Structure formats: C-alpha cells, structure tokens
Amino acid sequence: LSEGEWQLVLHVWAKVEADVAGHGQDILIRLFKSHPETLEKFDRCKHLKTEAEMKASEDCKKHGVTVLTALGAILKKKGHHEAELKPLAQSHATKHKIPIKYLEFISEAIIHVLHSRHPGDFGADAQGAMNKALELFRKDIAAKYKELGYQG
Numbered sequence: 001l002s003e004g005e006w007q008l009v010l011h012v013w014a015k016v017e018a019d020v021a022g023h024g025q026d027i028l029i030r031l032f033k034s035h036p037e038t039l040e041k042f043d044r045c046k047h048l049k050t051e052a053e054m055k056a057s058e059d060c061k062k063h064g065v066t067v068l069t070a071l072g073a074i075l076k077k078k079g080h081h082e083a084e085l086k087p088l089a090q091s092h093a094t095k096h097k098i099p100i101k102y103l104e105f106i107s108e109a110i111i112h113v114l115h116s117r118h119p120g121d122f123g124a125d126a127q128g129a130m131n132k133a134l135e136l137f138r139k140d141i142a143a144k145y146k147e148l149g150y151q152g
C-alpha cells in the first residue's frame with residue numbers, strides 16, 4: 001500500500017475509534033445477517049434470536065470489540081504486523097478453525113458498516129485503500145494458515 005493509501009485507511013479508522021463498541025456490534029450483526037453460517041462460531045451469540053438481544057449482550061458485543069481492537073493495531077502497523085498476525089493465525093487456524101472465506105465475509109461487513117456510517121470519509125478511493133489493507137491482512141493470514149498445516 002502507498003503512504004497515501006495508508007493515510008486513507010487510518011483516516012477512516014480514526015472514525016471507528018470514536019465509537020468502537022458501536023462499530024463492533026454493527027459489524028457482527030451485519031456479518032450474521034449476510035452470512036448466518038458464521039454465527040455457529042460464536043458461543044455467546046449463537047443462541048440469541050434478535051438483533052436487539054445481540055446489541056444488548058455484553059458477551060456478544062465482546063468479539064465485536066475484540067476484532068476491531070486487534071484489526072486496529074494491525075492496520076496501524078501499516079503492513080509490518082508479523083508479531084500481531086502470527087498469534088492471530090495460530091488461534092484462528094488451530095483453535096477457532098476460521099476459513100479464509102469467513103475472513104472475506106467479515107471484511108465485507110467492515111466495509112459495509114464504514115460506508116454506512118461514514119459515506120463522506122469513505123468514497124471510492126478510501127474504499128479501495130481499505131480493500132487493499134484487508135486483502136493484505138487476508139493474504140498474510142492465509143500464508144500463516146498453510147505454514148501451520150491448515151488449508152482453510
């Protein structure tokens with residue numbers, strides 16, 4: 001990614017930082033709406049029946065915030081995130097068993113929510129930059145997955 005692309009990424013990310021809990025719950029609800037098979041991975045969401053019950057569950061809100069916290073830390077490294085990605089690939093490949101396609105799904109949800117809340121700060125060029133950052137994240141995770149013997 002160019003420095004200009006990183007700056008567009010970190011510019012919209014600063015808007016997520018103004019309300020992490022809120023962005024977090026929206027992204028998870030969008031993920032589950034769009035790709036209900038993913039809900040199975042979340043023991044603290046999967047028995048909840050409505051958006052409103054999810055938005056009100058402290059423990060369902062938790063992976064929403066966890067995701068954004070970790071992804072925030074990774075994006076701020078602007079590509080130099082081996083120390084953050086190694087452990088994330090370890091857990092998601094060997095314990096949680098998250099296929100790369102589920103990482104595409106969550107990327108789609110992030111993009112959707114950012115555009116929904118911040119259309120003024122998230123036009124074509126910013127969406128392009130964010131897509132590149134998340135593609136890089138997925139490409140790097142994927143290679144770590146294979147190193148660990150997970151072909152997901």
Ligand code: HEM
Binds near residue numbers: 066106
């Ligand atoms: C944006 C990409 C993602 C990031 C940055 C991310 C980050 C994290 C982090 C930091 C944790 C806690 C520590 C760990 O176990 O490694 C975690 C846990 C977990 N993640 Fe992810 N994750 C992502 C995508 C996903 C997806 C797509 C799923 C499944 C649909 C998933 C399922 C889980 C599960 C089941 C846990 C354990 C429960 C929990 O601690 O919340 N993750 N994730």
